[PDB]
């Protein structure tokens, strides 16, 4: 084992609205986005995103 360097994606742009958010995302290569609720139901969603 050792330490490997990995890139950091462009910071998302978050737009708020009543009980919700909109993340504008830019990633030239496939970047993983994983969201989950902190309640009884996780409602976990995972997606590899490319482009903008």
């Amino acid at each position: 084992p050792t330490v490997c360097p990995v890139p950091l994606a462009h910071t998302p742009t978050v737009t708020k609205w009543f009980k919700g958010i909109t993340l504008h995302l830019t990633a030239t290569r496939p970047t993983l986005l994983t969201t989950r609720k902190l309640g009884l139901r996780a409602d976990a969603t995972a997606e590899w995103i490319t482009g903008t």
Binding site: P1, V14, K16, W17, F18, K19, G20, I21, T34, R36, K37, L38, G39, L40, R41, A42, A44, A46
Partner: protein, 439 residues
Amino acid sequence: FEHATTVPNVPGIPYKALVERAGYAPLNLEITVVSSELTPSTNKEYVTCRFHTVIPSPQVKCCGSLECKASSKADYTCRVFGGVYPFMWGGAQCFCDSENTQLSEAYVEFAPDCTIDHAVALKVHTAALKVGLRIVYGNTTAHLDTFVNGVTPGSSRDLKVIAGPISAAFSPFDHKVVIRKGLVYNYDFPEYGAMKPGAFGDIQASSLDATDIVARTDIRLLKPSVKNIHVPYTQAVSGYEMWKNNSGRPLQETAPFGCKIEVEPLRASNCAYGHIPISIDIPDAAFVRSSESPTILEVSCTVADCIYSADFGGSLTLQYKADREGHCPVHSHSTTAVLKEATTHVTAVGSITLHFSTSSPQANFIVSLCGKKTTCNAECKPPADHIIGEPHKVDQEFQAAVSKTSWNWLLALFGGASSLIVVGLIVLVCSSMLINTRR
């Protein structure tokens, strides 16, 4: 003195309470769940990884016969074939064109790189929740680690506390768990001994170095066809790789209640759910009797602009007239409002400005200063923002969650019908009595 309360199991959010001993002055008690650790008890059923299909060099009984022995290797497979007449490099290996049997032997072992690339299978049992807790009373702060079960007490050198049980037990881990390079998955792995080829746990062992490896990889040996020497075999793909491709996201990204999964040992830290009943024996030494503490004479409340949100978006002022300079503890006696400051310097006469956060549309709550209670009445507007990076510090109830305008309208509308039915009943009664009297 012993005090019982119910703290909300949410890390980082303070919970404030007031203990009101009859003889002594009221005292503050603030409580913060610094960290939690929901850890289960686990046993290692087996470990699995890529299998190295090792094929011993074939032997030929050059002009005789062979019989397959019964070894105890993992997925051992041995077969005997008839005359082959094999070639190595010199055009011949035997002298009998027929009755030149060959023995094809093959089995599996652990790959050389499984010491890092392997998955451990575990079963979980009832999980005990442990809490690191910071509690302050008056002047004294205390850190203590305790078990939330209702029997095991935590202690800090003068202060005894007992916590739990949790209101609703919960465990993010299913019965069967798989650990892979620290990643946690809830996979129903096959039981030990029940190998199936082409799926997870096709090769199993008690440990990496264990020699009693058992596997079922569907390896089969075929007749050698080409003239040159070799042992052909077809085998199902490694089920470890199949699970790796279709593993899915780990439990670190799917556990509910915002619980942070961790390994070595398996645990779930900072897991917010339920309420912890806590009974605490706060010492009487810290208590200060009312005869020495400043008991204020008359206090009044004037509320400024307020807003119901997670952040401290409410402000108010207490205009107080007291008799001595001291350190009164200020508190709120409502479940839908929480203050920022705990102990405030009180003068003979003056005013103190304080902050608070509420969940109700209105601030209709009682504030206490050195025991004296005053009802603050306000009207909080909806929050201007939409999202915060902070948690809501107060639960939203049903009673104190609707404005007095809506409450007044609803009560008027319902009382209209109630008044109507009662006036109808008395009208019927009076008509009957009038009929009876004038009959």
